[PDB]
């Protein structure tokens, strides 16, 4: 067959051009001439040879050259070399889509296949970013930088920002790559840090100081997400901070001797008691624990007694510190109905 | 208020005057003067051409001699404030040029006109056209319009132009509007008589 | 179909990207990059500027430091696919710049907004404005709105800014909405008390 | 007054600029700077000084320079010098309107006065084109060229075309200047030529040859209008051709001995009789004269006679030559009712 040798020859012309774009030699390439060869290929029902061929050329470049350049930089400027490889791939794929535009508008549209841009993202994801050693090193580098910053060290936030935005784009208008490769081990590492930091604060600080320190960590983790990561990570990290520091120590915080809720009710620390209400409202069974400890103290004081002095004091705590919550209101009202039952 | 239609009229006025014209299109011996920015906005071919990434990016002359002049001229008029005067005879050539230059605004207007005015006398010609220019959208529609007017088209003038492979595709299975379940060999006889 | 609104959106996309930009507007320290053809189509100032008849015709930089930046920037956005977000505070400055640059599309949209939203609290300010910028259309309308709200405006904050010549023009003959035929000297007293 | 000396000084800057445009020295003029001076002048209610001043500067240029250049070319290339003066004025006024654009959009709009373009046309019309000696010479040159072309000479049609299009534009979207200065003496001169040419053809040609010669002159005068003059002159000239050659000789043409209508009815010249019908239908009382002469011959032939041979012959003339006209039909039918009355 003439065309079996002719179409293989017209492809070699386009194959050489794509390879020239990969070498950044696009400067001396003719768009007009190269577009006609791709235009004639699609019209003569030979788009299969062009599409399958494109995949094989891009795969060749990302395995033999791009993957090796990243693997030979694992110890010196890893994130910088990987980001440069990512930017070079994006610049190449745009100009590859530029010359093969007729295939990107006619062939991929009616045959229902991935476009030049999406095809490039899949090969760069599977052969470079998600490749064994690179995938592990990217995870270990990003997690160490966050762990160092939490200790009080200065890290390249921009390098973390670029690596996270790269993982988001490689998910093909999704967060599947960013979640699996970065978010999941990040929340697992963070939970281990927040639990160890919780144990420190419960032994070297007061209950009032603890609540303010948790709020400081909530606002610190929001800043890290907004400046270094994707803003979709804001809710999952805050929930980890809330679980490890509040939820796992709810009864402990309120039962702190000469510092907890009972101590705050005695001394009448209005603004300080309000801080506990603002933090415990974030977690489930938080305000329930505050009510149970309050009812335990209120019932004992009313038992000891006259009663109009207690109701006036607890109404002041309800409106100012507990923001007139219906759960706290029925707890106070329920305890005063119990004192009338006694006599 | 929207003054987009008023602005394009002044730009088209500058185009005729020769004002701000920084590009010329050459088709054999004919010349059309336009603006680089305007052509890049509607047609993605010119957008990729004047992208400063190729040797042809920084030029004043573009040679498109392989395309129809009246088709290219009317398409530039369509890019500007002039509406496309679509007719059954020119739409065949305007769609081909619009497909090459990849103008979304013109490719839709041409396809919609072809699908709307797809008569029994037209479908026979539009099928062979879509089979050459790989337009599966019109290729399927013209095929359906041929199958519903099969016995009227066997005596038609354009019936001789239909290929052997196309005849097999038509008679292949079903959907062909034939009241008698024995018209299929008679259709083959009429094709062998028209093509000889 | 009309694709004029679609085309201008791609041109505005090229403007933000920096594509085909062959002109820059300088206002003190701020810079706005645009296209020579687009600015000439809506504004007749740029059309006469880039006419190849003057020394300033063949240049890349235009200095308009005597005009308001946010006004010029929004007017260029109006020339492109962005609609003008008109408010009582900025319309005063957008009309002045549109009058200088002579953009018909923007001068009408601003005048129509001023005439529509000409309240008792606004008319007092729009009269002194039109008296400075020689806009007889708004000058007559603001004068009529002042005369119909005269007794409400004598106690208003902006009453002190009205000139001696303007006070004579108001009290001059008739049309001033005063139920009692002896309010005229009392209006003069309130002006002499507010201006001192 | 400071401004009485300041505004007079800012005007001198604009006055010098307008004079530079008139000398074609616009190349080294700054639009940006000149526009501000005109902008400040209109805003400060000093547009009167700018408008009155503009009129005086344009008037100075067209009287002292332009008028003198035309008057010094009356014998050598008059139309060429006048057309150049017209083109130079148009080019100057556009650039004058360009720098004084703010006055042309604000001052003339609200004060209801003529724009820069229209003001220039009035001064060029009154001081150059309609000026005594130039106005007479333009009329004498244009009329001589048409009179020469009618004799069989070759004249510059383009020079006539440019001079006529100039007179049309100077009428301010009207034909008042073209009508008074050119059309009126043109129709007066033409009528004198057509009447003398009519006298020649009536003595050296046949009635049939005359009708075809008038049609030739109608088509010749239409060509002259379409190629050298304004197309609004098509109807007035055709009416002059029709009046001088047909209307003034209606009875003469039909009463021509051995050539007229009576001769055509005898010989049965069907297509030749149809030519007379086509020409006489243009003028009032034309077909009426044809009917009166036909009825005079038909009544005498029916009087001499049998009658079925005359009705058959006249029905053939009615349908083929007279295009089944109702006036000719009632004339034939009326004459045959008269023959029945005789006996």
mmCIF file with all atom_site columns, C-alpha atoms in Angstrom, chain B residues 86-151:
data_model
loop_
_atom_site.group_PDB
_atom_site.id
_atom_site.type_symbol
_atom_site.label_atom_id
_atom_site.label_alt_id
_atom_site.label_comp_id
_atom_site.label_asym_id
_atom_site.label_entity_id
_atom_site.label_seq_id
_atom_site.pdbx_PDB_ins_code
_atom_site.Cartn_x
_atom_site.Cartn_y
_atom_site.Cartn_z
_atom_site.occupancy
_atom_site.B_iso_or_equiv
_atom_site.pdbx_formal_charge
_atom_site.auth_seq_id
_atom_site.auth_comp_id
_atom_site.auth_asym_id
_atom_site.auth_atom_id
_atom_site.pdbx_PDB_model_num
ATOM 1  C CA . UNK B 1 86  ? -26.102 32.236 3.211  1.00 0.00 ? 86  UNK B CA 1
ATOM 2  C CA . UNK B 1 87  ? -27.345 30.448 0.014  1.00 0.00 ? 87  UNK B CA 1
ATOM 3  C CA . UNK B 1 88  ? -27.543 26.681 -0.884 1.00 0.00 ? 88  UNK B CA 1
ATOM 4  C CA . UNK B 1 89  ? -24.719 27.059 -3.497 1.00 0.00 ? 89  UNK B CA 1
ATOM 5  C CA . UNK B 1 90  ? -22.034 28.948 -1.455 1.00 0.00 ? 90  UNK B CA 1
ATOM 6  C CA . UNK B 1 91  ? -22.641 27.317 2.041  1.00 0.00 ? 91  UNK B CA 1
ATOM 7  C CA . UNK B 1 92  ? -20.788 24.152 0.819  1.00 0.00 ? 92  UNK B CA 1
ATOM 8  C CA . UNK B 1 93  ? -17.550 26.180 0.294  1.00 0.00 ? 93  UNK B CA 1
ATOM 9  C CA . UNK B 1 94  ? -17.979 28.640 3.256  1.00 0.00 ? 94  UNK B CA 1
ATOM 10 C CA . UNK B 1 95  ? -18.160 25.703 5.770  1.00 0.00 ? 95  UNK B CA 1
ATOM 11 C CA . UNK B 1 96  ? -14.929 24.069 4.368  1.00 0.00 ? 96  UNK B CA 1
ATOM 12 C CA . UNK B 1 97  ? -12.915 27.326 4.736  1.00 0.00 ? 97  UNK B CA 1
ATOM 13 C CA . UNK B 1 98  ? -14.479 28.056 8.193  1.00 0.00 ? 98  UNK B CA 1
ATOM 14 C CA . UNK B 1 99  ? -13.464 24.509 9.304  1.00 0.00 ? 99  UNK B CA 1
ATOM 15 C CA . UNK B 1 100 ? -9.811  25.074 8.198  1.00 0.00 ? 100 UNK B CA 1
ATOM 16 C CA . UNK B 1 101 ? -9.540  28.587 9.768  1.00 0.00 ? 101 UNK B CA 1
ATOM 17 C CA . UNK B 1 102 ? -11.490 27.200 12.827 1.00 0.00 ? 102 UNK B CA 1
ATOM 18 C CA . UNK B 1 103 ? -14.026 30.051 13.286 1.00 0.00 ? 103 UNK B CA 1
ATOM 19 C CA . UNK B 1 104 ? -16.665 28.853 15.795 1.00 0.00 ? 104 UNK B CA 1
ATOM 20 C CA . UNK B 1 105 ? -19.126 31.684 15.005 1.00 0.00 ? 105 UNK B CA 1
ATOM 21 C CA . UNK B 1 106 ? -19.216 30.780 11.265 1.00 0.00 ? 106 UNK B CA 1
ATOM 22 C CA . UNK B 1 107 ? -18.975 26.938 11.548 1.00 0.00 ? 107 UNK B CA 1
ATOM 23 C CA . UNK B 1 108 ? -22.231 26.909 13.640 1.00 0.00 ? 108 UNK B CA 1
ATOM 24 C CA . UNK B 1 109 ? -24.164 29.380 11.370 1.00 0.00 ? 109 UNK B CA 1
ATOM 25 C CA . UNK B 1 110 ? -23.251 27.284 8.258  1.00 0.00 ? 110 UNK B CA 1
ATOM 26 C CA . UNK B 1 111 ? -24.078 23.877 9.880  1.00 0.00 ? 111 UNK B CA 1
ATOM 27 C CA . UNK B 1 112 ? -27.452 25.213 11.195 1.00 0.00 ? 112 UNK B CA 1
ATOM 28 C CA . UNK B 1 113 ? -28.359 26.511 7.670  1.00 0.00 ? 113 UNK B CA 1
ATOM 29 C CA . UNK B 1 114 ? -27.419 23.125 6.055  1.00 0.00 ? 114 UNK B CA 1
ATOM 30 C CA . UNK B 1 115 ? -29.431 21.089 8.667  1.00 0.00 ? 115 UNK B CA 1
ATOM 31 C CA . UNK B 1 116 ? -32.471 23.468 8.351  1.00 0.00 ? 116 UNK B CA 1
ATOM 32 C CA . UNK B 1 117 ? -32.506 23.545 4.492  1.00 0.00 ? 117 UNK B CA 1
ATOM 33 C CA . UNK B 1 118 ? -31.666 19.793 4.108  1.00 0.00 ? 118 UNK B CA 1
ATOM 34 C CA . UNK B 1 119 ? -34.156 18.980 1.287  1.00 0.00 ? 119 UNK B CA 1
ATOM 35 C CA . UNK B 1 120 ? -34.411 15.824 -0.917 1.00 0.00 ? 120 UNK B CA 1
ATOM 36 C CA . UNK B 1 121 ? -32.613 17.700 -3.773 1.00 0.00 ? 121 UNK B CA 1
ATOM 37 C CA . UNK B 1 122 ? -29.813 18.845 -1.356 1.00 0.00 ? 122 UNK B CA 1
ATOM 38 C CA . UNK B 1 123 ? -29.112 15.760 0.902  1.00 0.00 ? 123 UNK B CA 1
ATOM 39 C CA . UNK B 1 124 ? -27.734 13.731 -2.079 1.00 0.00 ? 124 UNK B CA 1
ATOM 40 C CA . UNK B 1 125 ? -24.971 16.400 -2.601 1.00 0.00 ? 125 UNK B CA 1
ATOM 41 C CA . UNK B 1 126 ? -24.284 17.146 1.127  1.00 0.00 ? 126 UNK B CA 1
ATOM 42 C CA . UNK B 1 127 ? -23.513 13.435 1.888  1.00 0.00 ? 127 UNK B CA 1
ATOM 43 C CA . UNK B 1 128 ? -20.611 13.121 -0.660 1.00 0.00 ? 128 UNK B CA 1
ATOM 44 C CA . UNK B 1 129 ? -19.368 16.527 0.686  1.00 0.00 ? 129 UNK B CA 1
ATOM 45 C CA . UNK B 1 130 ? -19.366 15.422 4.388  1.00 0.00 ? 130 UNK B CA 1
ATOM 46 C CA . UNK B 1 131 ? -17.759 12.052 3.375  1.00 0.00 ? 131 UNK B CA 1
ATOM 47 C CA . UNK B 1 132 ? -14.781 14.010 1.896  1.00 0.00 ? 132 UNK B CA 1
ATOM 48 C CA . UNK B 1 133 ? -14.492 16.685 4.667  1.00 0.00 ? 133 UNK B CA 1
ATOM 49 C CA . UNK B 1 134 ? -15.005 14.118 7.557  1.00 0.00 ? 134 UNK B CA 1
ATOM 50 C CA . UNK B 1 135 ? -18.082 15.992 8.962  1.00 0.00 ? 135 UNK B CA 1
ATOM 51 C CA . UNK B 1 136 ? -19.874 13.118 10.824 1.00 0.00 ? 136 UNK B CA 1
ATOM 52 C CA . UNK B 1 137 ? -22.650 15.540 12.015 1.00 0.00 ? 137 UNK B CA 1
ATOM 53 C CA . UNK B 1 138 ? -23.899 16.377 8.464  1.00 0.00 ? 138 UNK B CA 1
ATOM 54 C CA . UNK B 1 139 ? -22.789 12.888 7.149  1.00 0.00 ? 139 UNK B CA 1
ATOM 55 C CA . UNK B 1 140 ? -25.354 11.157 9.443  1.00 0.00 ? 140 UNK B CA 1
ATOM 56 C CA . UNK B 1 141 ? -28.126 13.776 8.785  1.00 0.00 ? 141 UNK B CA 1
ATOM 57 C CA . UNK B 1 142 ? -27.736 13.690 4.946  1.00 0.00 ? 142 UNK B CA 1
ATOM 58 C CA . UNK B 1 143 ? -27.697 9.839  5.125  1.00 0.00 ? 143 UNK B CA 1
ATOM 59 C CA . UNK B 1 144 ? -31.044 9.861  7.054  1.00 0.00 ? 144 UNK B CA 1
ATOM 60 C CA . UNK B 1 145 ? -32.568 12.364 4.542  1.00 0.00 ? 145 UNK B CA 1
ATOM 61 C CA . UNK B 1 146 ? -31.347 10.130 1.612  1.00 0.00 ? 146 UNK B CA 1
ATOM 62 C CA . UNK B 1 147 ? -32.901 6.994  3.246  1.00 0.00 ? 147 UNK B CA 1
ATOM 63 C CA . UNK B 1 148 ? -36.308 8.756  3.748  1.00 0.00 ? 148 UNK B CA 1
ATOM 64 C CA . UNK B 1 149 ? -36.351 9.904  0.039  1.00 0.00 ? 149 UNK B CA 1
ATOM 65 C CA . UNK B 1 150 ? -34.551 6.808  -1.488 1.00 0.00 ? 150 UNK B CA 1
ATOM 66 C CA . UNK B 1 151 ? -37.178 5.982  -4.225 1.00 0.00 ? 151 UNK B CA 1
#
